[PDB]
RNA sequence: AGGAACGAGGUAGAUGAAGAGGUCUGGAAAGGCCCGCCAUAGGAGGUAACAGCCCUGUAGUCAAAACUUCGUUCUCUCCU
RNA sequence: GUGACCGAUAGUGAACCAGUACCGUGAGGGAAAGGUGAAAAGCACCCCGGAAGGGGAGUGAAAGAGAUCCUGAAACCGUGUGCCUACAAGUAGUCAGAGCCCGUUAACGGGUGAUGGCGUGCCUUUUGUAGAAUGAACCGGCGAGUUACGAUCUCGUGCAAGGUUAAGCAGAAGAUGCGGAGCCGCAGCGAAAGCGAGUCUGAAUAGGGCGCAUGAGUACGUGGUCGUAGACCCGAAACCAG
RNA sequence: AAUGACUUAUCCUUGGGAGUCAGACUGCGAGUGAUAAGAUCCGUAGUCGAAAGGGAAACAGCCCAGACCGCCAGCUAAGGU
RNA sequence: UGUUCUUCGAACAGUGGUAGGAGAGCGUUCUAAGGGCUGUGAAGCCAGACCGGAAGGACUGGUGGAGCGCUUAGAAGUGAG
């Protein structure tokens, strides 16, 4: 028998175009650029899901460096003090929230001061 | 239609008992003054078709 | 068997391999034939008896004639086939053909001495082997050439 | 197999012992499946045909020359990518017939008869006495044996009163004793078979 | 190497069963529920929406003034 | 009379005034184009307008059903509205992200997003392409591993050292029942005569090659592949006949 | 290549199905060339081809390291503060 | 996904990939089996913030006005950038 196949193609095209909603110009309107933009967005989403894990970490390292340099130490000396003053595994964005809850960061900084000398 | 049998390969080769078809040696019809007797007593004997040749020519002799 | 569930035998049927129906399945664009060769073209391909212009294997080897015009195939009856008659009298090719041991008569019947027999048989055939005749005569049987 | 007899009035006292060689064997599911697929094939005609690239009513010239124009090559007026059609392979008229080996056929019919016996769907009616040619009597007979779904009527001597009747009932198919097959047995799920038909198909198959 | 009648067909037709069943939604029931019939007829197409019992119809019983197509008999013709 | 045949780019070129319109001096080539509603009951009448075309009022189950007239997508063209845009160098996205505006198949909600980080389309062909190498203006439809007959292998089924019948005759052009005519295997070797659990070469009761010894095929079905077929689609320049 | 160990889980035979006969760069060792070439032809190891990620500013082949997916977890390599 | 133990299952190891090989699946049309939705509204079209590992699938609201789906099988004019 003969197979026409009319609806499943248009279903695919509308699924791709609804995935490409909000794009600029013809990239939310025409299928053949929307599919390319959706595939490129998938690669970008995987890559940036990898990259967010480390640029958040570098922002927290910056904030901890600023808060430590308020107290007279650099970042590297503060982290060396935290590994020496007991094995404390206090993670860096909780240490960044500790300056939203000052002066709890200053007490850990004094704990770092205590056994660096 | 039926598969044609390669008549030339039917004239050269011969089926054996599975087989490993039988064949004759080359260099056995001409210029015997330039070949030694030890070559001729071995070329007058029969040989077996090698496996690399067998995987190529076994379709040509399917109908025996 | 119930008709509204017709379950096939496991392994008896297989899905036909779709060729050139997308890249995710495998056998995609190039359809299993590689890139830009003669074997990738439509319609072949070369002959099976072709080595790319090298002189082929059959053309390097001599002919080995010949074929006899009137060759008889006196074949085949072994000694173990005669044990199917219990106890059996008058072993005849006209009887052996309708028994089912011999499928087709080819100009005669030759009885060959592979195996052994243990019974008394009156044996009629066209030719006998030297070991088969002695094996019939050692059991007390009679072998006679038609 | 212990199959109770029926005499379409009582019915009835007594029974008939069918042989175990036909109605008592273990059913082979794959054999009946292959028989069903073999029988469903060759019932279809295969009378489907489309015009190939050579068979379309079209000229052999090319619409434009090979080089010079900024268009495609397009050697034929109606190539498969054109609107003129279109198919290189298509459907072609062919026969779907194939034959199973004979032992598989006998095993299929005996196994489907045994599988109907062990499901207690077999009804035995001796001689099928029918006085008139009316289908009302046959419907009353089918009502008296509590048959509401589809059914077979197997008749050894092929009586005309049985044959002309019950062909207007959509679920009832009257078949001869040697005319039995896999599809009618698997399709109706109940058969009404006479003693003469059983005593025929026991020695036929 | 010429014809006359009997039997079956075609070119054309007739007859041919059974429900306005009641209620509901509907623009219209051929649909749902509860109910009875015909059937050698439940092949199909229409009917205001998916008919078996609405129409044309179908299965069977039949018809042929006039053309032919076969089969049988007779006339006729031929024969050591 | 029937289709595990098509349904308006399909199926005859042609479901429609089709070998028609049109093109060519001629031979010849050769289209596109179906659908209101059950019933025209095809909008009486009023108003704007020269008319076309509208807005009411009617017929209709539906008038967004009103003459290419069932349903009516996308490219394309517009009108409104929520949020951002006139210091900004951007394969136009993604992650983070305040503000503003709404409430969902209530779900770590949806839309828009100032700003920061990262990021040179897709395909083909290539040692190597973002490539300034090729192809695509966009959207929709159509568009390329099929089928017949043989061969080989795997798996499944039936029977097993015996399996299978073809044509044909009966029989819903169906299954099947009859048909063993033939085919393959049941041990081979030798060029052949021939011999045979052996045979050939050879004077050889020696050696060696092939094969049992140490042992499963057959008939169908699916799948992979190969031959004969345009054979995976499209494409020449050319040749021959009338 | 041998027999005594410790690690590993690979290795032959048969049958079915292929693709590949344009390779490039780097390090080492040769030829041709002018011990010129992002040159040509070889042998050897790696990488690319067919490999994303981090570093060499960008830069297939260099250095470090092989991406099933998710996390707003930590420690490190090359390279840096 | 592979191996071992096998005491519902657990442990360990693996899971970049072109050409290519193998396996498991999702969709389209038609047919056979039963069973079931439909004018108290089918297919189709439009929108949604739903579900599944994927091809995909459901449920609501609107348009539409008459067919469609499910099942286990089987065939193919079997999926378009």
What spatial distance separates the first Cα and last Cα of chain D, rounded to whole Å? 17
- For the structural domain made of C79-145, what CATH number should be given? 3.100.10.10
Tell me if C57 and B53 make a contact (CB, 8 A cut-off).
yes
**H or E stretch at D154:** strand D151-155
Structure tokens given for D56: 């379309």
To the nearest whole Å, the CA of D12 is away from the closest chain C CA by 29
Residue B49 is given by DSSP the state -
Which residues of B are less than 8 Å from C49 in CB distance?
6, 8-9, 57, 60
Which nucleotide C1' is nearest A21 CA? F111
Nearest one of C98, C48, C54, C107 to C76, comparing CA atoms: C107
- Rounded to whole angstroms, the distance from the CA of residue B55 to the C1' of nucleotide G40 is 40
Instruction: Provide DSSP, C12-61.
Output: T-------SS-SSSSS-SSTTS-SSSSTTSTT----TT-BTTBPPHHHHS
Tell me if D30 and C9 make a contact (CB, 8 A cut-off).
yes
Neighbours of chain A (3+ CB pairs under 8 A): none
Which nucleotide C1' is nearest C44 CA? F231
Angle between helices D29-40 and D102-118 (to 10 degrees): 110
**Distance of alpha carbon D181 from alpha carbon D101, whole angstroms:** 15
**Distance of alpha carbon C101 from alpha carbon D157, whole angstroms:** 40
Nearest one of A88, A96, A86 to A65, comparing CA atoms: A96
Which nucleotide C1' is nearest A94 CA? G72
Residues 17-46 of A with CB under 7 A from strand H: 18, 21, 31-33, 35-36, 39
Angle between helices A75-84 and A104-114 (to 10 degrees): 70
With tokens 């970490």, the residue in question is A57
**H or E stretch at B37:** helix B37-43
To the nearest whole Å, the CA of C102 is away from the closest chain B CA by 22
Nearest one of D144, D136, D145 to D166, comparing CA atoms: D136
3-state helix, strand, coil in chain B (%, to 5): 30, 10, 60
Tell me if B57 and C49 make a contact (CB, 8 A cut-off).
yes
Task: Kindly give the pairing relationship between strand B46-48 and strand D151-155.
Answer: unpaired
SS (H, E, C) A45-73: HHHHHHHHHHHHHHHHHHHHHHHHHHCCC
Torsion over CA: C20, C25, C26, C29 (sign): positive
- Strand F contacted by D204 CB (< 7 A): yes
Q: How was this structure determined?
A: cryo-EM
Structure tokens given for B58: 């076994």
**Distance of alpha carbon B43 from alpha carbon A12, whole angstroms:** 70
Domain boundaries, chain B: 1-64
**Cis amide bond preceding C36, omega within 30:** no
**H or E stretch at D137:** helix D135-144
- Strand F contacted by C7 CB (< 7 A): no
Nearest one of D102, D100, D58 to D79, comparing CA atoms: D58
Neighbours of chain C (3+ CB pairs under 8 A): B, D
Which residues of D are less than 8 Å from C2 in CB distance?
186
Nearest one of D109, D100, D105 to D180, comparing CA atoms: D109
Nearest one of D121, D119, D88, D113 to D182, comparing CA atoms: D113
Rounded to 5 degrees, φ, ψ at D180 are -70, 155
- Strand E contacted by D25 CB (< 7 A): no
- Strand H contacted by D98 CB (< 7 A): no
Angle at the Cα of D73 from the Cα atoms of D72 and D78, rounded to 5 degrees: 100
Residue C48 touches partner B, C-beta closer than 8 Å: yes
**H or E stretch at D163:** helix D160-164
């Amino acid at each position: 028998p003969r197979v026409k196949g009319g609806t499943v193609t248009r279903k695919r095209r509308k699924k791709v175009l609804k995935l490409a909603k909000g794009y600029f110009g013809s990239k939310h309107t025409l299928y053949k650029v929307a599919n390319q933009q959706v595939m490129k967005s998938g690669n970008y989403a995987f890559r940036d899901r990898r990259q967010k894990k480390r640029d958040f970490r570098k922002l927290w390292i910056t904030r901890i460096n600023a808060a430590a340099r308020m107290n007279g130490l650099s970042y590297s000396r503060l982290m060396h003090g935290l590994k020496l003053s007991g094995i404390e595994v206090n993670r860096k964005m909780l240490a960044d929230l500790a300056v939203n809850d000052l002066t709890a960061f200053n007490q850990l900084a004094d704990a770092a001061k205590a056994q660096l000398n | 239609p039926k598969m044609k049998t390669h008549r030339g390969s039917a004239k050269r080769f011969k089926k054996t008992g599975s087989g490993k078809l039988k064949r004759s040696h080359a260099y056995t019809s001409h210029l015997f003054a330039n070949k030694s007797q030890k070559q001729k007593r071995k070329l007058r004997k029969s040989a077996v078709v090698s496996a690399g040749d067998f995987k190529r020519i076994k379709q040509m002799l399917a109908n025996i | 068997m119930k008709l509204h569930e017709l379950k096939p035998s496991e392994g008896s049927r297989k899905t036909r391999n779709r060729v050139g129906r997308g890249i995710g399945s495998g056998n995609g664009k190039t359809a299993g034939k590689g890139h830009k060769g003669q074997n990738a073209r439509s319609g072949g391909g070369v002959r099976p008896g072709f080595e790319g212009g090298q002189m082929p294997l059959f053309q390097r080897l001599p002919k080995r004639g010949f074929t006899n015009i009137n060759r008889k195939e006196y074949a085949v009856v072994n000694l173990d086939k005669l044990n199917g008659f219990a106890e059996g009298t008058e072993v005849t090719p006209e009887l052996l053909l309708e028994t089912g041991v011999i499928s087709k008569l080819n100009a005669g019947v030759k009885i060959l001495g592979n195996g052994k027999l243990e019974k008394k048989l009156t044996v009629k055939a066209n030719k006998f082997s030297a070991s088969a005749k002695e094996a019939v005569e050692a059991a007390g049987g009679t072998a006679e050439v038609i | 197999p212990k199959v109770a007899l029926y005499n379409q009035n009582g019915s009835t006292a007594g029974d008939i012992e069918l042989n175990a060689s036909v109605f008592g064997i273990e059913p082979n599911e794959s054999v009946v499946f292959d028989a069903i697929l073999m029988q469903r094939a060759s019932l279809r005609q295969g009378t489907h045909k489309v015009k190939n690239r050579s068979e379309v009513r079209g000229g052999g010239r090319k619409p434009w020359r090979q080089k010079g124009t900024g268009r495609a090559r397009q050697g034929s007026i109606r190539s498969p990518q054109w609107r003129g059609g279109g198919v290189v392979f298509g459907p072609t008229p062919r026969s779907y017939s194939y034959k199973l080996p004979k032992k598989v056929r006998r095993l299929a019919i005996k196994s489907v008869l045994s599988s109907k016996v062990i499901d207690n769907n077999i009804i035995v009616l001796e001689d099928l006495t029918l006085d008139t040619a009316k289908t009302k009597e046959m419907a009353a007979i089918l009502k008296g044996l509590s048959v509401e779904k589809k059914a077979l009527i197997v008749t050894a001597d092929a009586n005309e009163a049985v044959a002309l009747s019950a062909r207007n009932i959509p679920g009832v198919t009257v078949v001869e004793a040697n005319g039995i097959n896999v599809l009618d047995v698997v399709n109706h799920e109940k058969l009404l078979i006479t003693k003469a038909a059983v005593e025929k198909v026991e020695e036929v198959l």
